[PDB]
Amino acid sequence: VFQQLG
C-alpha cells in the first residue's frame, strides 16, 4: 500500500 514521500 502507498506511503507518501516528501
Added chain:
Amino acid sequence: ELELVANFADIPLRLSQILKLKPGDVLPIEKPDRIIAHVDGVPVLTSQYGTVNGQYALRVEHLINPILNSLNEAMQDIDLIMDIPVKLTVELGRTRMTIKELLRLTQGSVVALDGLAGEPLDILINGYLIAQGEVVVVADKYGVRITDIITPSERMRRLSR
C-alpha cells in the same frame, strides 16, 4: 505501447557545470510537492509520490483530460560556449502503459514506476541518460547527489548527437 515518465526535478545548468560534474556533487533542487507525469513530453497528470511497497509510485491527483483523450484519437569558463543552457533532468521513474490503462486512471489511482526506492534515479540531458543520482535531504533542503556519471567527453557527445 506508451511510456509514462515521472520527472522529479528539472535543473537548469550551463554546459560548463555539466562537464565539471563528478560523483559526490550534490545539486540543490526544490522540494517537489507535486509531480507532473509526461508522455513523449506532454503533461498528462499531476500526482503526489512515494512507494508501494518497495517500488516508487504516483498517487494521481489530477488528469489533464483534453490531452489524455487526444492520445486516444579544455576551454576557459569565460567562454560564451561554456555558458550555453543545458537542462538536466532527474526522473523519479517510468512505466510502460496502454492508452486504455492510461485512460482508466482516476484521482487516487496508485501507479507504480519501474524502479526500486533507494536505488539511484536516472539523470538525463537532452533526453539521454548520462548519470545516476540519489536524493539527499539536509535540514529539509533537498538535493540530488551524483553517484555515477559518464565522462565529460561522452557527455559532450551525447549532448550533440
Added chain:
Amino acid sequence: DNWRDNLVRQVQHSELELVANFADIPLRLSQILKLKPGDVLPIEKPDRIIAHVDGVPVLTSQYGTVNGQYALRVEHLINPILNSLNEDIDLIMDIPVKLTVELGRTRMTIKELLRLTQGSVVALDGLAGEPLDILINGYLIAQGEVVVVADKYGVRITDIITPSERMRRLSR
C-alpha cells in the same frame, strides 16, 4: 508576533504572466547563428495550447482571435497547480538550442487567474496579424510569421538580431 492573528491584509494586486506558446523547435547552435530573414521554420500546427506561468503549465486552451488580438479559450484548468499558485568545434556547433515561437502573453492577478473557467476567453497582448515573438533562453531574438504551403505550416523569420547578439542572449 502575536500579530498576524488579528491582522487585516491590504489589497496586494501583484501580477503574473500567462504565457502561450505557438511552437517549440529544436535547432542546433549553428542553425541559430546562421538564421536570417526569409528562413522558414517547419512547425506542425498545434491542436491546442498549454499556457504556462513561470514555465509551469496551468491550463489547456484553444486559440484564435478576439477584438483583433490573439486569444485563448480555456479548455481545461490544471486545478492543483492553479490552487498552489494562490497558496571539437563541430560538437559545439551541434549543441541543441530550443527556439520558441510565442503566440502571446498577458498579465493577470492570481484572482483573475483563479476565476478562469472552461469557456473563458483570454486576450493576449499584441495584435493579431502582427508577427510572433521568437525566443531562445527566454530572450527575444526574432520575429516570425506563420506560413503555409500545402498542409505544411512554418514560421518565416521577418526580423532577427545579429548572430553576435544571438550568441549573447543564449549565454546570458
